[PDB]
Design a protein around this nucleic acid. Structure first.
Length: 80
DNA sequence: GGTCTCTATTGTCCTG
DNA sequence: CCAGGACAATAGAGAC
């Protein structure tokens, strides 16, 4: 296999939902910077019922479980 | 001038 | 299980 391939942390439920919404807001607000778009997303994400977040939670689960198969003894190591 | 850091958000995990 | 982090996706924007 490979040791020089970057491995990126699987995205939690917020980031899975934000990937598609951030695009969707970036269309409707095309001058806006992603720093400003994030402030919009966090506010929208607070406002979602736990019922409304559960589909993105389930998709985040699938990811992490798949992240395991591909990198099976993976340990998260933040740099410093 | 490519290449890296940073913004800004949440949730997840880490190392002190 | 606090305190102080890194870091997932995203393009703009500064720095060197």
């Amino acid at each position: 296999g490979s040791f020089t391939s970057r491995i990126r942390r699987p995205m939690n439920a917020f980031m899975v939902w934000a990937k598609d919404e951030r695009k969707r807001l970036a269309q409707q607000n095309p001058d806006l910077h992603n720093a400003e778009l994030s402030k919009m997303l966090g506010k929208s994400w607070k406002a979602l019922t736990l019922a409304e977040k559960r589909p993105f939670v389930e998709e985040a689960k699938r990811l992490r479980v798949q992240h395991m198969q591909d990198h099976p003894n993976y340990k998260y190591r933040p740099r410093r």
